[model samples]
Target: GSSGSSGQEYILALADVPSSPYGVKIIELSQTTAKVSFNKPDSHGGVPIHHYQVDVKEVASEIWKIVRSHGVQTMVVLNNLEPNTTYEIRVAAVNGKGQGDYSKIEIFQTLPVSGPSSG
Candidate 1:
């Protein structure tokens, strides 16, 4: 026999960055703000995720900025947004290692400041 050189069990410690976030959506919208929500990553990198991070970028631009670096909840409200403008959003998990990879980009637009009344 030549298969008797391995151990029976293994041990794991604090792992690398977590996996990407999921289920991102724009739950609410307004003229100057947006409510974004997402689900935690399926993997927490063998450690508890202390918080989450959010990034945003305008559709017309190529730069992504960190909006929320230490979000305690899965849902967050983005403020000071321009009306009728489109933007891209993404989320990531943060643990002992660091911020994980970002989720799939989600696009959303803010409502117009004033629209024609139909009354």
Candidate 2:
């Protein structure tokens, strides 16, 4: 069970759910991509869940959308975003029981657009 004042404050208690053992981890990030991963819990309580979900948002945007779902781990690639733009990312664990609280929010910046250099 997940309970807390806010997403960052929320903690995934291993004791509450015996089967789901691991917590979310943000493995990588790049100019236009982010990767999130987690290990399956030691137990499944007889029913196994096959996927996980992640949410992401631009720094200036108010809405958070589901970037990826139904994946054990996900690498999300965003396109058409302005160069040097900043983004915020968050992820949550989901299963038959329900959605767990999101991991701590993280911030990243895209690489600057490349341009021709003058001699």
Candidate 3:
């Protein structure tokens, strides 16, 4: 069919990211670091995941600090931390749409380092 004569035909729809990410697990990695991982977001918003947003806060007597600006990541790795100190962290998925809902806040801590000596 070599017939030409079309303008407004096909339909188009906008796309956006899903609701939010899910399944957050925090684990101790080193003497002064930890790993925070989670499963991919359940919703894709009809688009691929472009990046991830990570927020960290050092828990204190009764205050919470958000974190530095533009903290981006997927599986976040925290370093240079105070041993035995508590921390609060969260993650969110971003796509062509925008930033999805944040995952449930998870508590994390890294125990002090111990020398490996003979018993």
Top-scoring candidate (TM-score): 1
The collision pairs in model 1 are none
Using TM-score as the yardstick, the better of models 1 and 3 is: 1
Off by over 4 Å in 3: 1-13, 61-74, 116-119
Model 1 agreement with the true structure over 1-119: per-residue lDDT tens digits: 34666553243343578898888898898878899878878877776788888888799999877776444689888987899899998888878778878788888999988856754
lDDT of 3 at 57: 68
The estimated TM-scores of all candidates read: 0.78, 0.57, 0.68
Give the winner by lDDT: 1 or 2: 1
Single out the weakest 10-residue window by summed lDDT for candidate 2.
9-18
Q: State residue 28's C-alpha deviation in candidate 2, in Å.
A: 5.5
Task: Itemize residue pairs with steric clashes in candidate 2.
Answer: 21-41
- Candidates sorted on TM-score, descending: 1, 3, 2
> RMSD to the native, candidate 3?
6.4
Best lDDT among the predictions, by candidate number: 1
Which ranges in model 2 have alpha carbons more than 4 Å from their true place? 1-30, 36-47, 115-119
**Residue 66 lDDT in candidate 3:** 39
lDDT of 3 at 107: 79
**What's the number of clashes in each of the models?**
0, 1, 1
